């Protein structure tokens with residue numbers, strides 16, 4: 459059972475000067491989106507585009523994935539994305555990320571039917 | 583088994599949410615801290631002071647809890663906290679919170695040996 463003391467810490471404690479700071483975006487999203495359980499996912503990109511625009515990439519430019527698979531596609535246009543990358547100081551269970559906002563082309567692997575994005579490969 | 587398409591949306595999609603937004607704090611924090619599972623937690627306060635300063639409230643001003651219990655204590659000084667409350671448009675599982683930065687005295691219930699904070703009662 460989660461002790462009452464530990465529950466209180468989880469539900470009400472967030473010690474710090476700038477808790478609502480945008481440089482915290484990745485720390486909170488990586489946690490919310492469940493990518494900090496068991497280990498700290500080292501790198502992860504968030505796309506701030508319409509889901510309609512991201513799905514459209516699956517019928518755009520064909521390219522080879524980094525792992526040799528052949529079901530990857532590159533966006534014809536650049537997309538507003540946020541790069542979340544683990545800091546040198548990050549150490550599980552205290553995962554820390556650097557938030558970087560950029561506009562780059564994305565590369566995703568598409569699968570299933572209808573064909574939709576199932577993996578983020580890279581940004582170029 | 584979560585679908586590949588759904589897994590991609592959870593891990594890489596953040597349409598209509600600006601990374602450079604202070605108002606989003608509550609939404610991400612409530613999600614990250616596991617308070618939006620099963621249903622949306624109506625109200626929840628986050629304290630930004632040090633854990634030591636919060637624990638010390640248990641040795642301060644003795645007051646009655648809202649529920650009639652007698653193990654509540656009020657802080658001698660105002661503390662930096664964030665008040666999170668559901669919006670009108672909040673609907674599970676799309677929980678939405680309004681973020682309000684405030685400086686008020688907190689009231690907590692203390693228990694255990696040593697006596698540590700185990701429930702947040704109110705800010706005044």
Ligand SMILES: Nc1ccn([C@H]2C[C@H](OP(=O)(O)OC[C@H]3O[C@@H](n4cnc5c(N)ncnc54)C[C@@H]3O)[C@@H](CO)O2)c(=O)n1
Pocket residue numbers: 501502503504523525527528529530567568569576577578579580581593
């Ligand atoms: N700039 C970057 C660089 C990396 N990343 C992330 C996304 C990847 O996560 P995810 O998309 O869940 O991938 C899940 C898993 O899917 C598998 N996979 C690889 N190629 C695939 C393909 N063509 N189709 C389906 N699954 C594939 C292996 C992979 O670990 C992870 C590992 O490469 O790094 C990122 O977000 N931004």
Ligand SMILES: Nc1ccn([C@H]2C[C@H](OP(=O)(O)OC[C@H]3O[C@@H](n4cnc5c(N)ncnc54)C[C@@H]3O)[C@@H](CO)O2)c(=O)n1
Pocket residue numbers: 469625626627647649651652653654691692693700701702703704705
């Ligand atoms: N401004 C406000 C107003 C409300 N709230 C939150 C905190 C409460 O969650 P929690 O901290 O778990 O504490 C409530 C739970 O703790 C337990 N509890 C309640 N009274 C207690 C007491 N006197 N001693 C020990 N545990 C108590 C059971 C109870 O459901 C929640 C429901 O009252 O509302 C807030 O964060 N800020």
